[PDB]
Design a protein around this ligand. Structure first.
Ligand SMILES: [Fe+3]
Length: 308
């Protein structure tokens, strides 16, 4: 048989009831483990994601001074590297995010405002997400240009560290790239390639996602820059990734999809994309080889996937 997949954007609502219910915040080594206030705050954000329904505005949240401080520290520290380390598309949109979304050290941008801004850029939109979605569900949302986004922030005791994505990572790492046309298309191609795809191939696409959307390097003229969200939200790894230490290889999906990696240390190897249009073409070609008895297409006019 073929695994179920949403045919309409509203159907993404099925995902909220298929996440991992025992999150990282519950682990003994989590920065906020012993903090009961943090614990309740996280549950509060998880309840918002749980009750969220496609089409609704994303609830605004008054962040505490402590949380704004953690955001400020992360913002301030990462900002210094973007001009020289981030890909052109990133730096091109950041000023706009600062002007229209309140991307500033003293303020944590609200997801609703960021979502509206993205929608006017590429039709991408955000949906608050509780915890960990399976790769199949996470990738599936991209097909509709929907990005499942965390709303909670890392624990304040370790502002430069997070064992999971949190709002700083989503907004400083992912968001600026989703405002780029080609990137949006490229991201969506991965999502489309995952619809109704067999588990074994979902894993291949998750790995490709890891080496592009999360830890990708882009060719820029005769130079190289970072566009991966995991890099763009990592002070240490962002500087490291463009140094002489890591091994760099051309994005080549047949090899990239099988490549192992660990999410604990700096990546020893990175794949370099020629451009987002090219990475998009490569994904499309790779999707072609995935054994699926059907073809899928997204119709932005009706917000439905057409199955051939
Ligand atoms: Fe991420």
């Amino acid at each position: 048989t073929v695994p179920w997949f949403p045919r309409t954007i509203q159907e993404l609502d099925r995902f909220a009831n298929q996440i991992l219910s025992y999150g990282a915040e519950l682990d003994a080594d989590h920065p906020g483990f012993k903090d009961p206030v943090y614990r309740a705050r996280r549950k509060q954000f998880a309840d918002i994601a749980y009750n969220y329904r496609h089409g609704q505005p994303i609830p605004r949240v008054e962040y505490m001074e402590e949380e704004k401080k953690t955001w400020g520290t992360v913002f301030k520290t990462l900002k210094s590297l973007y001009k020289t380390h981030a890909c052109y598309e990133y730096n091109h949109i950041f000023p706009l995010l600062e002007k229209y979304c309140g991307f500033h050290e003293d303020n944590i941008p609200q997801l609703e405002d960021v979502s509206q801004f993205l929608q006017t850029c590429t039709g991408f939109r955000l949906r608050p997400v509780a915890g960990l979605l399976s790769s199949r569900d996470f990738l599936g949302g991209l097909a509709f240009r929907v990005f499942h986004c965390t709303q909670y922030i890392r624990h304040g005791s370790k502002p430069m560290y997070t064992p999971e994505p949190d709002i700083c990572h989503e907004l400083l790492g992912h968001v600026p790239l989703f405002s780029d046309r080609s990137f949006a298309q490229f991201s969506q191609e991965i999502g489309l390639a995952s619809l109704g795809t067999p588990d074994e191939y979902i894993e291949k696409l998750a790995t490709i996602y890891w080496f592009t959307v999360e830890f990708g390097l882009c060719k820029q003229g005769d130079s190289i820059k970072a566009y991966g969200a995991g890099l763009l939200s990592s002070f240490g790894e962002l500087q490291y990734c463009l140094s002489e230490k890591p091994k760099l290889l051309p994005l080549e999906l047949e090899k990239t999809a099988i490549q192992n990696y660990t999410v604990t240390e700096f990546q020893p190897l990175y794949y370099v994309a020629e451009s987002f249009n090219d990475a998009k073409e490569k994904v499309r070609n790779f999707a072609a080889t995935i054994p699926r008895p059907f073809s899928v297409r997204y119709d932005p006019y009706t917000q439905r996937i057409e199955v051939l």
